[PDB]
Design goal:
Distance between the termini of chain D: 16 Å
Largest interface: E-F, 26 and 31 residues
Oligomer: part of a larger assembly
Strand order of the largest sheet of chain D: 1-2
Radius of gyration of chain E: 20 Å
Number of strands of chain E: 3
Shape of chain D: elongated
Chains: A mainly alpha (35), B little secondary structure (85), C mainly alpha (49), D mainly alpha (154), E alpha+beta (73), F alpha+beta (157), G mainly alpha (153), H little secondary structure (46)
Structural class of chain E: alpha+beta
Order of helices and strands of chain E: HEEHEH
Strand order of the largest sheet of chain E: 1-2
RNA sequence: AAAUUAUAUUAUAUUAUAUUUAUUCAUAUAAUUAAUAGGAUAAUAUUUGUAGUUUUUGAUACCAUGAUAAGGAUUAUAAAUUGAAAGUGUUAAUAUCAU
């Protein structure tokens, strides 16, 4: 999940319009769950 | 509580000389098996004195903090006073 | 002003705090001979290394 | 098999309630498919189990909406009809895994755990080197060494 | 330089020979001991200028005999 | 990256041989090396160390270090021979620093050889003039190297 | 009042004297133990009968010292100075930095004498090594700062 | 002690073994006497 | 008879029935008092068992504490954001050892 978020943020930084589907899929979204 | 740090600290045939005894036989007897200096006489000896040949040979008095060893034998020779009681 | 506290101690107060305390003579650490290879670690017992 | 200890039986509803942890763990479900694919056997109840739990894990974090009230019990019973339908397919794969594994273990000369039955070799529960010196439920003394279910020459 | 690097294994790092003298309580005796140890290390390392028998040996990772050589076994 | 087990399972209720659950001392774990530390029953100096977490963690760290050592030594197809500075090849005529002293040194950046000198392994058959001057009979045969420019089956001829 | 009863002051002062006797006796006892319990030869000069005679003589010297402090440090390292409550080192009944019990630490927190920062009771505070690896990693980091950063000479 | 000396041998060097030399003062944190009580070398306490 | 408040997960237990041990308990014990004192590179005090004796460890009480359980209202008219979550009020029983 962390790897997916890193790759998605890198794709958003490279091409800006990639943020339009990638935010809709929830890949740029951070959950706060600890142990 | 930490591991084996309690301030207040058994028959076994294959582990006779290795259970609650010194690890090596090269080492000497402890301090209570010898006289340090000028003494007026001790009421009791410590539990870590090794029973030697002269304990069962002479047999003047054996007082362990009580405990009275009045039955001398040679199966106790080479072992401290912990497992003898 | 009514409540002015300076954030820099003035030069007079630094000079007064410097003028009241002495210096340590071994802070100069000057050296021109070399190291005593034989004696300096074998000196007198009260002042020994 | 190197697990020869005495075991504790579990009901099948507690196995499937683990879900993605042990029952539908994806590494475990893949190597169950390699057992069926080796024998020339279609993996249809296993593919039925995977497609159900793939979609079941997808919405498992969503909260169910509050039902304000229905006159008849039809949408509640339909949601319960599909719920007990999904348990019975997963009950079939739970039996299909235990059926084929005990059948393969009879072919590979694999000795099972204690009180475990292999249909070809040991109709009773095979017990070998238990802490209890006798058979736990046949009430028979165990010989030394353990019972050999197969022949010798590998 | 090779003999000094081998004689001072971990005390040399990134082209700089460093010695941390902690032996005596005072720093003057510590810098005396450090100067003595530096001079002793330099005098031992200078032996490579005497001859080739003091040049330190290069450690080559020589392979085992290959399969072409093991085929003749 | 390795996917083997390193940590010890923690202390809890006495586990049973069920699904997703192994007992705390099983012969399957750590190659059976927990047989030294197990109690078969369902003297205090021989009973207290089997239940300490730091003791069992130190023991499994020792066993994983033994496994790492035997796998690093089974990788070795070579041995270290102390060769003098004159007879060594040109890549080793430099000042080689010690381990963990400097940056990991490339072999030859000028000759387009970017590789660690400490991982370089030289063939035995190319050093027979250095390692064996007293034999004089060529104890190892010369290594047959293939002609890369020869028209073979690899190049559709 | 007033500060603490005088029997507890006598007890803390006896603990300080035991620490001072440890500083007095530890080097001598360690050298005597390391000579007397060695089986390898001490040197090229002293070998054979001279080494065994020297080991017996240093054992006779070691046993003749009435009052030599051979007691380990962790047996009486839980003595509190302000109050008479006895804690256990290794548990939550003792704090190591200010060297008081849990009760005395709570009284000095509620009194305002110390400058301590409260943090959440299920976290690891603020130390990055403590959040990273726990108590053992900060233990190894204190070891790395104290000893292992120096190239010995 | 006279009956205690039979099974337990006597090793009595004397009080000379309790007083270390002056060259071993800084190794023993300034002390010379290995008594059960500490021994200060000043006359004001003494 | 609905809404779901529901935690849920797995394991253990006993004089089978007798034996060794970590703590607990019994009966034997050791330990006791008080106070200061500056020393190399300093323009000159030789000094420290000296000034202390009938030295300090001596007020556990009947105050009016505080914990427990229970019910209230306000905000979502946005598809954006890593993230649409936060503050404010009343009754019963129990209980109260500091001149």
């Amino acid at each position: 999940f962390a790897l997916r978020m890193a790759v998605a943020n890198a794709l958003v930084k490279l091409i800006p319009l990639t943020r339009i589907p990638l935010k809709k899929s929830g890949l740029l979204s951070v959950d706060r769950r600890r142990e | 509580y930490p591991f084996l740090r309690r301030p207040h600290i058994n028959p076994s045939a294959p582990y006779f000389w290795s259970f609650m005894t010194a690890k090596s036989q090269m080492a000497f007897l402890p301090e209570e098996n010898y006289i340090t200096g000028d003494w007026t006489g001790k009421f009791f000896v410590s539990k870590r004195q090794v029973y030697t040949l002269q304990h069962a040979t002479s047999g003047a008095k054996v007082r362990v903090k009580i405990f009275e060893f009045n039955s001398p034998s040679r199966w106790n020779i080479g072992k401290e006073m912990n497992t003898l009681t | 002003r009514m409540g002015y506290i300076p954030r820099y101690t003035p030069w007079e107060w630094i000079a007064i705090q410097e003028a009241d305390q002495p210096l340590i003579a071994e802070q100069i650490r000057q050296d021109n001979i070399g190291t005593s290879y034989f004696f300096s670690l074998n000196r007198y017992w009260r002042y020994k290394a | 098999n190197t697990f020869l200890t005495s075991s504790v039986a579990t009901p099948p509803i507690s196995v499937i309630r683990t879900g993605p942890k042990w029952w539908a763990h994806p590494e475990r479900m893949v190597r169950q498919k390699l057992m069926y694919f080796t024998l020339g056997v279609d993996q249809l109840p296993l593919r039925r189990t995977a497609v159900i739990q793939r979609d079941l894990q997808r919405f498992h974090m969503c909260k169910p909406p509050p039902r304000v009230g229905d006159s008849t019990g039809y949408k509640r019973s339909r949601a319960a009809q599909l719920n007990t339908w999904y348990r019975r397919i997963q009950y079939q794969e739970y039996h299909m895994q235990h059926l084929f594994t005990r059948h393969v273990w009879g072919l590979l000369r694999v000795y099972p755990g204690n009180t475990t039955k292999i249909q070809g070799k040991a109709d009773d529960g095979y017990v070998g080197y238990d802490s209890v010196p006798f058979h736990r439920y046949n009430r028979a003394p165990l010989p030394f060494p353990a019972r050999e279910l197969y022949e010798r020459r590998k | 330089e090779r003999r000094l690097r081998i004689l001072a294994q971990h005390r040399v790092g990134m082209g700089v020979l460093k010695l941390d003298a902690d032996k005596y309580e005072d720093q003057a005796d510590n810098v005396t001991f450090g100067t003595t140890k530096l001079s002793e290390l330099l005098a031992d390392a200078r032996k490579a200028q005497l001859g080739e028998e003091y040049w330190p040996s290069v450690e080559l990772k020589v392979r085992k005999p290959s399969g072409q050589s093991k085929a003749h076994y | 990256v390795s996917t083997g087990e390193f940590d010890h399972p923690p202390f809890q209720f006495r586990q049973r041989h069920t699904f997703n659950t192994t007992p705390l001392h099983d012969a399957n774990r750590f190659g059976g090396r927990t047989a030294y530390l197990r109690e078969i029953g369902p003297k205090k100096q021989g009973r207290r160390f089997k239940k300490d977490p730091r003791t069992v963690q130190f023991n499994v760290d020792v066993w994983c270090a033994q496994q790492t050592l035997r796998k690093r030594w089974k990788q070795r197809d070579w041995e270290v021979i102390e060769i003098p500075f004159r007879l060594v090849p040109r890549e080793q005529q430099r000042v080689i620093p010690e381990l963990y002293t400097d940056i990991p040194q490339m072999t030859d950046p000028a000759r387009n050889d970017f590789s660690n000198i400490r991982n370089k392994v030289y063939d035995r058959e190319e050093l027979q003039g250095v390692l064996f001057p007293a034999a004089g009979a060529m104890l190892y045969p010369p290594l047959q190297r293939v002609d890369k420019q020869a028209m073979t089956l690899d190049k559709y001829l | 009042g007033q500060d603490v009863p005088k029997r507890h002051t006598h007890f803390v002062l006896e603990s300080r004297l035991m620490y001072e006797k440890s500083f007095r006796d530890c080097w001598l006892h360690s050298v005597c133990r390391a000579i007397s319990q060695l089986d390898e030869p001490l040197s090229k000069t002293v070998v054979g009968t001279h080494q065994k005679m020297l080991q017996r003589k240093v054992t006779c010297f070691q046993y003749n010292q009435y009052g030599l402090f051979k007691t380990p440090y962790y047996r009486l390292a839980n003595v509190d100075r302000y109050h008479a409550v006895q804690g256990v080192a290794g548990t939550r009944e003792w704090v190591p930095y200010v060297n008081v019990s849990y009760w005395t630490m709570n009284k000095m927190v509620r009194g305002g004498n110390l400058l301590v920062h409260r943090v959440h009771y299920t976290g690891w505070g603020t130390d990055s090594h403590l959040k990273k690896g726990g108590w053992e990693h900060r233990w190894n980091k204190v070891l790395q700062r104290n000893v292992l950063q120096y190239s010995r000479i | 002690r006279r009956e205690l000396e039979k099974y337990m041998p006597d090793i009595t060097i004397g009080p000379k073994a309790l007083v270390t030399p002056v060259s071993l003062m800084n190794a023993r944190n300034g002390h010379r006497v290995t008594h059960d009580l500490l021994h200060s070398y000043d006359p004001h306490i003494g």
